[PDB]
Structure 1
Amino acid sequence: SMNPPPPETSNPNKPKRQTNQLQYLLRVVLKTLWKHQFAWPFQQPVDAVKLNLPDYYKIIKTPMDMGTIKKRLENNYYWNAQECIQDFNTMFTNCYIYNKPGDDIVLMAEALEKLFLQKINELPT
């Protein structure tokens, strides 16, 4: 298939954790970013069949999206906030990698990344 399986949202071999920072990342950061006018392309894994992007997964080897991140947070999949933040950063970077400077989708990622950074600048203790 053109589409690989989506990234795991559970892994019984991996330990779970809940922290105040992870709770914040779900309740405030993700759930607020989700409502942004530019969030829609990033709310689910890229579907290469739907979007007619047969090269997407030929180029992007560590796919990530906010749907996956949300499920991971809901599952307590992450050990800590930094692990979650790394997934957001992978999502943004993938967008810059797959596309070109100035592309509409890149302008969307750039705006979301700024909002994301604003929100994670300060996390709860």
Structure 2
Amino acid sequence: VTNQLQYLHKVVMKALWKHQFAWPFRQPVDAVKLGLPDYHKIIKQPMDMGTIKRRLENNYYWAASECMQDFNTMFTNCYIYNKPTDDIVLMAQTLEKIFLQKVASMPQEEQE
């Protein structure tokens, strides 16, 4: 497995998964459960930490950059769809700041 995907699993996902703001992102947006009949109109590429976490457990990723894009798509989905004033937006912002400051310490290069 890659040095960088190992960092993404054990440092980034470990931090973000147990975070007190993580729960709205731990599973796919369920448009029916949440009452969002336009969600899949607006968000064409849904993403969530459950999917990323399993994808790290199943070595589905080839490069770290593609794990990073899933994280980024997840947060971007949230800012695009939700209202500027929704608490979910500031939860995503808080989680994204951690993702970014962890990524600033990720190795370079590749392995495996």
Aligned position for 2:20: 37
Aligned position for 1:52: 35
Aligned position for 1:68: 51
How many residues matched? 108
Q: TM-score, normalised by structure 2?
A: 0.92
Q: For residue 103 of structure 1, report the CA deviation from its aligned partner.
A: 1.5
In 2, distance between residues paired with 1:33 and 1:101? 22
Aligned position for 1:102: 85
Q: For residue 124 of structure 1, report the CA deviation from its aligned partner.
A: 2.9
Q: For residue 21 of structure 1, report the CA deviation from its aligned partner.
A: 0.7
Alignment partner of 1:77 out of 60, 69, 78:
60
In 1, distance between residues paired with 2:5 and 2:50? 16
Alignment deviations for residues 44-79 of structure 1 (CA, whole Å, 9 cap, x no partner) = 001112111111111100110000000111111111
Q: TM-score, normalised by structure 1?
A: 0.82
Residue identity over aligned pairs, in percent, reads: 80
In 2, distance between residues paired with 1:95 and 1:115? 16
Question: Runs of at least 4 residues of structure 1 off by over 3 A?
Answer: none
In 2, distance between residues paired with 1:101 and 1:50? 22
In 1, distance between residues paired with 2:86 and 2:37? 19
Aligned position for 1:89: 72
In 2, distance between residues paired with 1:110 and 1:119? 14
Structure with the higher fraction of residues in helix conformation: 2
SS in 2 for 1:49: helix
> Can you give the 5+ residue segments of structure 2 that lack an aligned partner in the other structure?
none
Alignment deviations for residues 71-102 of structure 1 (CA, whole Å, 9 cap, x no partner) = 11111111111110011000000000101223
